[PDB]
């Protein structure tokens, strides 16, 4: 249920493959999907979730560097997958930028994203 | 044990009074503490904490505006007070800046501060 294309509310596209071993591999890109806006993503998920109706815990990371650009930062998304007719991945993320020691206090942004299978 | 002057590891001074009703009132200022660096702080704390050795939950807010400067932002600290010879207040904070709708996704920074009674 996790493998496939996901869309958030900010105009980003998430394409991922969930392996039987708990691995998440894929690409994070812009709505357009141009080569310069594609980044590698890697993560992990619970490959044997509870059967009491609970969501599936997961998380992934994207370092904002590809063969064309580098933003010297990385974002990690932590959340859970909820299946069904209106399946979604509810997450909270942390975006950390490489900073000097003096600016370390303001190195991390926090937010939340909801991904759905439909735009 | 909460009333008094506290210092974090970033050169800031926290002066607060803990009311019997659970109110926290005081001022947040720089190491120096000049008029232009003083801001009002208000918060709440658990006035009847558990007696099993648990900390005392608390939180406070500071809007970064005074009669001289305005940073159009506000920080909230959430954490707990731990008494003893080495008393401390361990917190995690969220700093939100006023932004346009387009920049709302990067409006909040997250971090952590530890306050002690000694510099």
């Amino acid at each position: 249920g996790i493998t496939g294309t996901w869309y958030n509310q900010l105009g980003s596209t998430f394409i991922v493959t969930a392996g039987a071993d708990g691995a998440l591999t894929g690409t994070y890109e812009s709505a357009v999907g141009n080569a310069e806006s594609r980044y590698v993503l890697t993560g992990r998920y619970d490959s044997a979730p509870a059967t009491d109706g609970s969501g599936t815990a997961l998380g992934w990371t994207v370092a904002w560097k590809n063969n064309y650009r580098n933003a010297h930062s990385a974002t990690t998304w932590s959340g859970q997958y909820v299946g069904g007719a209106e399946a979604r991945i509810n997450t909270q993320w942390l975006l950390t930028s490489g900073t000097t020691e003096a600016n370390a206090w303001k190195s991390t942004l926090v937010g939340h994203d909801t991904f759905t299978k439909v735009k | 044990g909460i009333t008094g002057t506290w210092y974090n590891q970033l050169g800031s001074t926290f002066i607060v009074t803990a009311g019997a009703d659970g109110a926290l009132t005081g001022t947040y200022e720089s190491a120096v503490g000049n008029a232009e660096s003083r801001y009002v702080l208000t918060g709440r704390y658990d006035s009847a904490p558990a007696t099993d050795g648990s900390g005392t939950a608390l939180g406070w807010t500071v809007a970064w505006k005074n009669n001289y400067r305005n940073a159009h932002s506000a920080t909230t600290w959430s954490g707990q007070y731990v008494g003893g010879a080495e008393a401390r207040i361990n917190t995690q904070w969220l700093l939100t800046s006023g932004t346009t709708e387009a920049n709302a996704w990067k409006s909040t920074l997250v971090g952590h501060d530890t306050f002690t009674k000694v510099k």
Partner: peptide
Amino acid sequence: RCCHPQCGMAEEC
């Protein structure tokens, strides 16, 4: 408006 990959940046700023 967006100048960081995360907000869906397409072209560089």
